[PDB]
RNA sequence: UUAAGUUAUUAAGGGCGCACGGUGGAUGCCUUGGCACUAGAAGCCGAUGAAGGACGUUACUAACGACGAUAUGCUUUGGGGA
């Protein structure tokens, strides 16, 4: 998942960020209830958010020059 | 049976020796770190916010490292081949 991101509009980038955060908050918020058995899934999510914001920032630069 | 004479047996415990352990950690051997130096480079960092630090970040997480709310790491460019 590196150039799935490059296929975006610079506006869809925001929405998948938000929805990924709600996905996450669902998991974090279940997590102390113990409903969750999945452990390593969260890393994938948080890393995705890192990617989306990274690329958004890079294009933020190259839309500045 | 008598008088006289002599004399050892005892080891509660101790000493000498001999053995078997226990204690505690020297010596022997080794190095996971260091001392002193040669050749060569480099000899600065910072208001475009340092050096140094606080608080946090892991699936469960107390500490060191690593990192900083994009958080136990992100993208790219090369290298490498489970």
Which of A10, A17, A18, A11 is closest to A62 using CA atoms?
A10
Angle between helices A12-31 and A41-62 (to 10 degrees): 150
Give the dihedral of Cα atoms A35, A40, A42, A59; nearest 10 deg.
-160
Q: Write out which nucleotides of chain B lie closer than 7 A to a protein Cβ.
A: 58-59, 70-76
Using the CB atom, is residue A6 less than 7 Å from strand B? no
Using the CB atom, is residue A28 less than 7 Å from strand B? no
Residue-level length of chain A: 65
Using the CB atom, is residue A53 less than 7 Å from strand B? yes
CB count within 10 Å of CB A52 equals: 21
């Amino acid at each position: 998942k590196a150039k799935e991101i490059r296929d975006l509009t610079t506006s869809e980038i925001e929405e998948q960020i938000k929805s990924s955060k709600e996905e996450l908050f669902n998991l974090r918020f279940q997590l102390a209830t113990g409903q969750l058995e999945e452990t390593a899934r969260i890393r994938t999510v948080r890393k995705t958010i890192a990617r989306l914001k990274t690329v958004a920032r890079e294009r933020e630069i190259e839309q500045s020059k």
